[PDB]
Amino acid sequence: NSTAELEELLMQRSLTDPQLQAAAAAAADFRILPDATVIKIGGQSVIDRGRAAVYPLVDEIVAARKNHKLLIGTGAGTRARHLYSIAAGLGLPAGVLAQLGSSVADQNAAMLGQLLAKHGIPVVGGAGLSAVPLSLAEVNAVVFSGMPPYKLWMRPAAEGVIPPYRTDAGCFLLAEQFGCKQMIFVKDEDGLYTANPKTSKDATFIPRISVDEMKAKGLHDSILEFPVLDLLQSAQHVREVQVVNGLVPGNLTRALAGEHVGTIITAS
Amino acid sequence: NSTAELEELLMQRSLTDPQLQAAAAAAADFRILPDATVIKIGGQSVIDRGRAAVYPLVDEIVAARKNHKLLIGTGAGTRARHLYSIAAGLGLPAGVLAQLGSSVADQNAAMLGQLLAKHGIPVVGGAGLSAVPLSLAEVNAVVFSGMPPYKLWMRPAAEGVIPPYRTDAGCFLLAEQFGCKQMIFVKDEDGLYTANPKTSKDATFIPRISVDEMKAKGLHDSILEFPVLDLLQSAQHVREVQVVNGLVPGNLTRALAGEHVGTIITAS
Amino acid sequence: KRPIRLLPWLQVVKIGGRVMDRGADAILPLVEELRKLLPEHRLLILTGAGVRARHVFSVGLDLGLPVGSLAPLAASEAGQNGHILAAMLASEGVSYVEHPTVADQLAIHLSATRAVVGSAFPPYHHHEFPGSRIPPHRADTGAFLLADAFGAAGLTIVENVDGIYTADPNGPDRGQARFLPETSATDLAKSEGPLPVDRALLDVMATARHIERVQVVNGLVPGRLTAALRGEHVGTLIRTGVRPA
Amino acid sequence: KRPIRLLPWLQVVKIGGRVMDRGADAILPLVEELRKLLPEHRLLILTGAGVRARHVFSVGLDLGLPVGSLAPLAASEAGQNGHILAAMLASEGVSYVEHPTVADQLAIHLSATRAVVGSAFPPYHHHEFPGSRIPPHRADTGAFLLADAFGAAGLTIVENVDGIYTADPNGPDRGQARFLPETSATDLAKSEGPLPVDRALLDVMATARHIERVQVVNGLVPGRLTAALRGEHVGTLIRTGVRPA
Amino acid sequence: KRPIRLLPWLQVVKIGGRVMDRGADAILPLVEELRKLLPEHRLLILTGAGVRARHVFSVGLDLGLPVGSLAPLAASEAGQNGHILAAMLASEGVSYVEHPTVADQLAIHLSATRAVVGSAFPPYHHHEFPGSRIPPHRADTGAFLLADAFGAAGLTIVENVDGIYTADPNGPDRGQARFLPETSATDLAKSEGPLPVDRALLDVMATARHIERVQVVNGLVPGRLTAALRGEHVGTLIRTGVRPA
Amino acid sequence: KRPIRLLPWLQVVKIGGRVMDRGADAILPLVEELRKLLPEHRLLILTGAGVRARHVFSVGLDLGLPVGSLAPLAASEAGQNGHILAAMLASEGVSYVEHPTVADQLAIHLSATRAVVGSAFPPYHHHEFPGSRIPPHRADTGAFLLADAFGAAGLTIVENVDGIYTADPNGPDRGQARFLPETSATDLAKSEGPLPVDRALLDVMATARHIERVQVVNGLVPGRLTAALRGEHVGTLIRTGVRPA
Numbered sequence A, B: 001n002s003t004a005e006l007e008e009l010l011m012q013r014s015l016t017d018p019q020l021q022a023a024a025a026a027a028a029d030f031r032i033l034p035d036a037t038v039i040k041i042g043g044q045s046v047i048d049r050g051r052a053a054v055y056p057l058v059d060e061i062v063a064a065r066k067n068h069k070l071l072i073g074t075g076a077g078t079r080a081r082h083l084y085s086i087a088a089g090l091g092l093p094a095g096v097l098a099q100l101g102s103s104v105a106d107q108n109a110a111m112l113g114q115l116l117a118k119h120g121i122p123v124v125g126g127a128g129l130s131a132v133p134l135s136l137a138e139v140n141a142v143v144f145s146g147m148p149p150y151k152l153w154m155r156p157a158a159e160g161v162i163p164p165y166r167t168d169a170g171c172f173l174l175a176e177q178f179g180c181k182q183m184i185f186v187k188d189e190d191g192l193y194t195a196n197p198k199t200s201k202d203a204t205f206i207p208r209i210s211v212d213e214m215k216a217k218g219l220h221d222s223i224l225e226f227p228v229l230d231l232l233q234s235a236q237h238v239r240e241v242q243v244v245n246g247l248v249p250g251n252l253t254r255a256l257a258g259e260h261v262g263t264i265i266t267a268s
Numbered sequence C, D, E, F: 001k002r003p004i005r006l007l008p009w010l011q012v013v014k015i016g017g018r019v020m021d022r023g024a025d026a027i028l029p030l031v032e033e034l035r036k037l038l039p040e041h042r043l044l045i046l047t048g049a050g051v052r053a054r055h056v057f058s059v060g061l062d063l064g065l066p067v068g069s070l071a072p073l074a075a076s077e078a079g080q081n082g083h084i085l086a087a088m089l090a091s092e093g094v095s096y097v098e099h100p101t102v103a104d105q106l107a108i109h110l111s112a113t114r115a116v117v118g119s120a121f122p123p124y125h126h127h128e129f130p131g132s133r134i135p136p137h138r139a140d141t142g143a144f145l146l147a148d149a150f151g152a153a154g155l156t157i158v159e160n161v162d163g164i165y166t167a168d169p170n171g172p173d174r175g176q177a178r179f180l181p182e183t184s185a186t187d188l189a190k191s192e193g194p195l196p197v198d199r200a201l202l203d204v205m206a207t208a209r210h211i212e213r214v215q216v217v218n219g220l221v222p223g224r225l226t227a228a229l230r231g232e233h234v235g236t237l238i239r240t241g242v243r244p245a
Ligand SMILES: Nc1ncnc2c1ncn2[C@@H]1O[C@H](COP(=O)(O)OP(=O)(O)OP(=O)(O)O)[C@@H](O)[C@H]1O
Pocket: A041, A042, A043, A044, A045, A046, A074, A075, A076, A077, A078, A166, A167, A168, A186, A187, A188, A189, A191, A192, A193, A194, A195, A196, A197, A198, A219, A221, A222, A223, A224
């Protein structure tokens, strides 16, 4: 293996060529923002609930950013479900619903961003990324919309028109792309259970589990978008994630301090 | 000479009028970013060479920006030459080739920018300029694409369709516009020689030379785009430039410290 | 039932970047063929990336950059090929349009003029999927995702080879390479070895909703693109496994 | 004298967000009616916001946000309804266009195609007026400001009710609600109580320069929009108090 | 050989900013003349800056600003004149288009509609050349750079004077000013003294590839622009020193 | 005052029958030039008769037939040349149209398509004037009568020679034939000797109301027709003695 061998294959073979693919796998691995943590703030599970859920999390973000670099992504929530319902009923395809859902995540980022503005924390976009490096350096945090940019090019699910890659996937892929050290999903339950705790009365809490174990237990589509689990098994940089209850005061803070609150889901 | 005389001419004469032109020449001269240095990182001579050339320069940039304010522009390189070749063969004009070359300089700025992001240094654009003042103030450096914005309005050369104003000219004109104190071209040779050192075996190194002397020696089109030499003779603020070898460890650092590495080319 | 077709009268044509890489010798005849097709079809013409993307992958991988950094770098090269092709067709009223315009205003633009040119790469950008160090969702994949989302009448992939063979017909094993006039995406997905189309194209064909077949044809042979847009069999047909309504 | 008319041949149609909120059952017949109108009129179709804006107002007010923060949040929902409606009309050459395009390039877009769709909310954004915690310049108001600035031939407001009544016909007092076939903006402005149109619509009607009357009609009854665009009286006519030149 | 012509059927018309500065008295007849030309020619109409740019140069020079700061300030004024002229032509389907649209999508826009309006100033911006404190690449220069890059059929410069004289016909020496029906760019470049066109226009004419002659005509005389676009000699012809293929 | 112009944006091009008589060698380049002009001009293309009319004059005169019998016989040959030229342009949307359609529906036909082809001979038919045994009102004369009645922007006569000479440049005296770059109809009318244009063309120029000049150019030299339609001087200019309004 060497640079020249890789360049020769890159020139002479299709990118589909297994030999090229394998030489590309041996390339060095640079992490762009290795000291940052990505946090997803759930749309339905947090922001849609208003002040009682959002204000304590704003306070935690403001306290946290003294010792932690944070990229804070927003979910979408009930207005996206309403849009999905209207558009699906008209027969529109998943790529059109994907565009509609992004606007709701953008709304949520704008609302969260306005509560954080006086602390210097911007909503980014516009520039995309490169407002990120300066903001992270100076103010230690930025807010972004969590929906992936695929829009009309969204791959559809096997069945139905709901976009399969939504704001859990968007935030996860940003953590993976930047090589961040940590990915925290902030939801409205303590973590993963053996069943949906809102539907089932005797579900059991799961502190730690791998993707394969989750699949073997029927939990592919539970507290995270199920494609995220497959993205996690493919990831180069973020090989586990943590799901915590944002409605518990201090849970985000304690997760950033290394406490094992919530559920840790591992790629293997 | 007085403000009112200048305003009267500006109202009553064509801008082509020699008397107006001469009163305009006596106006005060404000430098926008007088404490900054513009650095061009060559596309073919540095970035196209990969890690062995770029990583040491990233380290120098990161060390330098503690004591120096830096505007770091990128060249284009071999992918632009490929585009120029395709487009010239189709008969396309210089203004179309100018747009194509800018995209390659943008690619190079994005790659350099990602290696610098964890140090807070952004790639600018989007905002154009006014991401520059804030970034320079806070993080002491910014990365930009070095191609001028002329695009379809590029003046053509006397012969052929290659855009005459490329990334040497773009970086130079930005230094001149901002009134920066220093302009450093980072290439892959120690400086100017009496002949192309890659083609000629007995070329002699030139530590310092004026534009007129270069023309008298047949060196109008050698290590810098030849229009840059004429721009330099017209400049108000940047009346000399330095060409250094970015492949020599520490050369950029030493040039920023005032050491006479490389070649200094003077307007007069 | 399946989603409606947004632009059922649209024909999508993807031009391989390596066709563009051959320069005037390939581009001028293709432009002349496209010119003649403009009064026959409503065309969305999407360009791939070609060899320049291989160069920026070489530099980017040498610098250690992740797959979400390489994806927009390659997409740039497909946009440049699109600007070149559109310039050659400008006098026919054809221009290059950016990805947001394709996603939101294609109908008005194809009402203004007979064809538009855009980039075939999809805007996955820094949200490209991990796993390979080479961006998987490239030009074939983006063009198909678009054509199928629109419910277009067809997608034709215009390459520098006659179609799909059992081995790379320009590669080491080219002597045992047999031409495949017809295949299914599911059979290709189970094969190993290189293809003239993205492997992710086969995955998005499995979830497709409208387009039943995609033809790969040689754009270096005048007349093949014209024949393919009339449904004539002149390259390799790929069956997506959409089944009729 | 009064300003010239910029687009005197334009018809502006504002679609209430709550019509869109009913989903396919309301949208499909309205799309079919719009399809038939495209060869008869040059249309600027502008969508309102509906119930999702009520939800984001509930969240935003619970977070304490000021009226200039709520205004662009509601405007987003009107843009989404516009993207949905335009998608349904894409095969007719109709696309959604952004506010800058409406303000600066509407003439070229209506030369390219028979109708375009945009958001009815005006871009007051963080410069919305203070006083109410609810943004006052909403979809009815923005559509009228545009139609009158252009000197358009008409503005028709398409709602989920027959027109204006003396009380909310879906509200507590619906039993004493009497239908008003005709009214003036000045008489409505002096009434208290709810209306199916923004109160700020009545204020901008008082300073209007061109449009003399605006009809509110039931978009859930096929054929009423068609009849209104021919000047037939099928809902409530609002006289602006522009008087003839 | 020389580059191809991108839009060989295009006519480019540059309107002096000082014509616009005269207000309705000059603009209304010019708009009526442009209206009649729309069915005869495919027009790119580009506006200059006029007196407001002189004011912002006075303020900017008083603040010490360099030539790359003054260039976009003047360009703004040319864009404003373009918005005014386009508004007057809106009912004919004419809109103002931004510089990126001119550079990349002019073909589709001139397929949608008969004429578009843009700014004549080129986007040199903060990369304007140093040497003079007055930006050299102004409206005449930008319009010619565009027309020649496109390989347009012509460029006509519409001014508030009959053409070029031997002295400023509104200046101190106006008594010895003699009209020049024809001249070459090389002869003008060797003269000193003011001109009604940018001196940089003469420099870009020396490197031109397609346009052989440019006519300067009086837009305050109805009918001269019409006659010039048919090649009739009604002002000053400038020979660029392009020589035939 | 003079009559209004009916179609002031029209360009009329008369193609000599003897150009058509040269067959593909002349016709194919001319068709390719016309194809490129279609997006630049609104064209009425009118064909003359050529050598076949000489043959039918020989037969008709041998049978004793009067000038009103020979006139429609020659006109037939101009119609045939028009059908041939239109067929070659059919794929561009060009068709031949009959004399009544030219006289009454040209405006709608030039709204449908960029150019139409008709016969240049006027319908004088059995009411041709007596005096010569050769019909006087032929193709040059009919094309000018039409162009001037319409108030067209120009008439260009496309021949197999560079323009008018002092003697027939293909005749006995061709050695003393001197080229005339410019002349007036009144000076030609006072000369004796042959011309490349009908003598009756000079008579109808004396009563003309709109067209001031007519250019005769060599259609066998690619590019001359294009240049003439932009007013460039590349053949013989004939001044009609219309004087400006
Ligand atoms: N096995 C499980 N354990 C825990 N929670 C579960 C499980 N199965 C389903 N859930 C549900 O998933 C929800 C969390 O996902 P949800 O999509 O609501 O969060 P979100 O991130 O706010 O979404 P968005 O941001 O897309 O609005 C919980 O409220 C819970 O009711």
